[PDB]
Write a protein that binds this ligand. Structure first.
Ligand code: DXT
Ligand code: DXT
Ligand code: CL
Ligand code: CL
Ligand code: CL
Ligand code: CL
Ligand code: MG
Ligand code: MG
Lengths: 207, 207
């Protein structure tokens, strides 16, 4: 079919969403596209190339809160940004796995510069701003990852009997599985943001 | 070679550390063990079985701070536990990927019950205790994941030119790569723990 960047990415993203990160192989991508492998190799040289581009395009399509509103608090911005990041990562199977270990792409430079600049404008050093942004990303990535993988592990094998569970775990597990991970994520998110605040506002005060 | 659980796990863990989660295939495990595939299948039925058992055994070997010291603060316990979790996950390649989406194993029940109980003894509801423990796990998993995958992505392809970078990103990237991720992790960890505290101690007070 069509082999421009957009369509290769389209198809890869579909393939990723079907079969996960394990099924995103250049052989299987060729089959989806209805092409031979040397044809695909002209456009895509290897899996890592593809993963990097999927990471970028997942956010370009589905990460709608990359930048703060006018006069937005840094706390509101991080909260909205994280929610948005999470939603984007959850949109495709292994979406979070695809992002891991990437660094911002040239197409993301202005955006991520603005984010970094905004944190500094709000009282953070670059370093402390970056630590906050990293922490929010990492927390969100792990939350999504554990959600997405747990759901995949369910399809493979079942959990063991309820019968053997000690009571707080048994209850913990019901809570965990009472939603998709969203409640615990939002709660963790506010914790995290408030700790940044405690840190920012302490300035030199031992805190 | 020997095909008891311990030795299958030994060899899988070696295989995982060599070739990562992609190379942990029952075919390649058979080759490492020097056995035929039907021989291996008797002991290990599929990849997910193996992943679950590796998740458990990684912590059994290398997660040394699972339980609080006598009279330890919950804040100290989370900090020490997280450090310990991180160290365990970083010990093997894709160690964090292996953990994702698991739930506690029967062999971990007493431990994780004690952890849950301890948080409740320290003022948390089960639910808020679990949200704190989840948040600490997720943050730590994402931190480790992004560290481990970034290092793998380096071996594949290089970062693009420094030349095009806007200045705060350029600086951010040096900071990020000034250590293995540890400084940012520890900083994020204290933020997170202090936000739990703010939340715990607020009780009913709007906070
Ligand atoms: C500042 C970026 C950065 C800087 C240095 C090293 C890095 O690895 C990064 C990132 O990876 C970032 C992202 O991935 C973003 O998700 C990122 O690229 C992104 C975006 N394109 O809008 C975000 O919304 C960010 N958000 C907190 C989840 C986040 C970035 O802020 C950083
Ligand atoms: C309470 C456990 C739990 C409860 C309900 C659903 C879950 O998925 C879990 C976990 O997955 C936990 C872990 O993985 C631990 O890492 C876990 O199993 C573990 C351990 N074996 O010592 C830890 O140190 C924990 N730590 C915060 C990283 C953590 C556990 O507390 C939880
Ligand atoms: Cl074309
Ligand atoms: Cl605001
Ligand atoms: Cl044997
Ligand atoms: Cl203490
Ligand atoms: Mg990133
Ligand atoms: Mg776990």
């Amino acid at each position: 079919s069509r082999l421009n960047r957009e369509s290769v990415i389209d198809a890869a993203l579909e393939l990723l969403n079907e079969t996960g990160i394990d099924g995103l192989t250049t052989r299987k991508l060729a089959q989806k596209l209805g092409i031979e492998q040397p044809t695909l190799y002209w456009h895509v040289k290897n899996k890592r190339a593809l993963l990097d581009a999927l990471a970028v395009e997942i956010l370009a399509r589905h990460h709608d809160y990359s930048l703060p509103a006018a006069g937005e608090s840094w706390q509101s911005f991080l909260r909205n940004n994280a929610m948005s990041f999470r939603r984007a990562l959850l949109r495709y199977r292994d979406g979070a796995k695809v992002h891991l270990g990437t660094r911002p792409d040239e197409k993301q430079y202005d955006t991520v510069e603005t984010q970094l600049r905004f944190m500094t404008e709000n009282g953070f050093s670059l370093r402390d701003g970056l630590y906050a942004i990293s922490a929010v990303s990492h927390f969100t990535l792990g939350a999504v990852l554990e959600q997405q993988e747990h759901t995949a592990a369910l399809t493979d094998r079942p959990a063991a009997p309820d019968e053997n569970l000690p009571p707080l775990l048994r209850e913990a597990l019901q809570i965990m599985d009472s939603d998709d991970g969203e409640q615990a994520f939002l709660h963790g998110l506010e914790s995290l943001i408030r700790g940044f605040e405690v840190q920012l506002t302490a300035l030199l005060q031992i805190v």
